[PDB]
Ligand SMILES: Nc1ncnc2c1ncn2[C@@H]1O[C@H](COP(=O)(O)OP(=O)(O)OP(=O)(O)O)[C@@H](O)[C@H]1O
Ligand SMILES: Nc1ncnc2c1ncn2[C@@H]1O[C@H](COP(=O)(O)OP(=O)(O)OP(=O)(O)O)[C@@H](O)[C@H]1O
């Protein structure tokens with residue numbers, strides 16, 4: 289048995305490699321004298337899927353190193369497509385034909401010619417047969433499988449499939465014998481990451497550049513979700529500070545410093561700022577009780593085995609910063625995975641491009657254990673307008689099934705809408721699908737207003753005395769983003785005229 | 800091994816908690832459909848049948864569909880759901 293992971297190359301996924309070893313590759317490592325009776329033909333092909341950056345391509349070559357081929361030829365799918373019809377399929381034919389010579393020449397004792405596809409998922413779209421929608425590339429796959437399971441079948445081969453979209457592949461491409469067996473890779477647990485860190489450090493520890501104040505046990509777990517690929521870049525970044533340390537003139541952690549730089553596959557901390565200008569200004573009880581409620585039912589999820597999915601939307605009148613509150617609710621529990629979906633970046637897209645950004649985000653999210661995702665300004669991406677009813681049916685349809693779509697077993701998430709008007713939604717039947725709602729009343733009163741202004745501190749006691757004298761009495765109904773807007777508009781004034789400008793403008797709010 | 804035929808279990812995602820008998824009607828539903836599937840099971844000149852589950856917005860409809868289909872013991876079962884047709 290040659291399958292031990294004390295060999296350094298990869299780690300953390302030990303069970304999955306064990307499995308392929310268990311049922312996939314046992315035939316090829318066993319004394320053949322027995323099986324030569326049984327005539328058991330080997331797996332010709334295998335599939336493994338998972339997130340992109342989790343070190344799958346070093347598995348394949350490692351089994352090639354483990355059980356020696358001449359060498360791998362690795363290819364990328366898009367590296368072969370041609371406008372000219374003949375060329376693309378022919379390339380594949382060359383790849384296979386390299387082996388057939390040895391197989392027929394040297395019979396059935398030949399060594400493996402191994403193949404790897406970096407991503408199939410474009411080429412292996414599931415063709416379907418009818419007069420229309422035959423397909424664009426539906427004829428390359430025929431040549432492929434005809435090589436795999438075809439006439440003059442060969443036992444001289446091994447082929448590795450790779451994808452991040454396992455469901456689009458045709459079911460016959462992967463029927464048993466052509467590729468029988470599938471494995472899932474999922475983003476590694478902290479144990480796998482401490483192994484990986486042991487790996488990439490193993491030279492540094494030996495060369496003793498980094499001798500001190502370095503613990504992988506904490507430094508692994510402080511990140512709950514990363515890809516093993518980024519960590520090597522991280523280690524390279526960790527290597528960069530010692531070289532950026534000698535710009536001034538034997539190694540230090542800069543990891544705690546640099547982790548803020550890195551966009552993860554998972555959570556990001558640097559996207560708040562555009563959404564959070566000012567932080568969370570608590571003007572009164574409703575604000576704090578709301579985000580307290582957020583902190584309340586988040587625990588529901590994290591402590592629930594029977595409700596993986598939960599959902600709310602923060603409704604309220606406009607310009608109350610519901611977006612910001614949702615962002616804070618995300619930021620409050622230090623989740624593994626948080627992400628924004630917003631029209632800001634999906635701008636100027638068709639009804640089926642933004643959908644494919646959205647399915648991308650959630651199926652990206654499904655495979656994390658615990659997550660919080662947020663969608664802002666539902667009305668906008670739904671492309672709602674009152675004059676005419678107009679919207680894209682596609683979007684809400686594909687959205688609400690996701691609100692009713694449970695992720696795979698053992699993974700849980702909550703989802704957050706910021707919709708500012710729900711009458712449409714009640715009419716449009718998204719509101720029965722959401723579990724529950726939050727009214728976010730905008731500030732209704734001056735006694736709360738001046739309090740907030742004291743928290744900001746723009747205005748003096750006299751400037752504030754002005755307000756306190758004139759109106760205690762009105763109930764002003766105002767969204768706060770507008771408040772900030774016009775104080776900044778009055779903050780520029782002749783000081784004597786500063787305040788009553790604010791007041792006069794403020795009395796134009798309506799209702 | 801998942802086959803071309805019935806998912807051996809794929810049902811768990813549709814039923815996470817499992818159906819609970821809270822009274823008579825739950826029995827009523829799936830016994831009625833059980834006789835119905837007997838009807839298709841042994842008959843001539845009704846090669847197919849068409850049934851529909853009506854109910855209010857959350858009644859656990861999809862779940863009981865999975866239950867009836869499982870206990871029906873068919874060789875071949877597929878569920879087409881918009882989840883997959885997004
Ligand atoms: N606790 C708080 N109370 C009120 N406003 C806050 C609070 N914390 C932050 N904000 C402010 O909310 C503003 C965000 O704007 P806002 O999200 O209200 O526009 P919007 O509501 O998305 O627009 P629309 O009303 O069309 O949805 C920021 O300036 C932010 O500082
Ligand atoms: N008879 C029952 N007793 C107890 N729980 C049930 C019963 N039927 C369904 N459930 C629970 O309801 C949940 C599934 O409901 P399901 O998704 O089938 O509702 P549905 O009617 O399809 O909803 P919708 O009509 O909104 O799609 C599961 O957790 C399931 O255990």
Ligand SMILES: Nc1ncnc2c1ncn2[C@@H]1O[C@H](COP(=O)(O)OP(=O)(O)O)[C@@H](O)[C@H]1O
Nearest residue numbers: 298299340341342343344345346484516517520
């Ligand atoms: N144990 C491991 N787990 C995850 N990733 C690893 C591990 N060991 C190495 N890696 C990194 O995984 C990366 C995989 O990158 P590659 O396979 O080229 O892109 P993709 O993973 O998207 O196909 C490699 O660059 C490698 O540095």
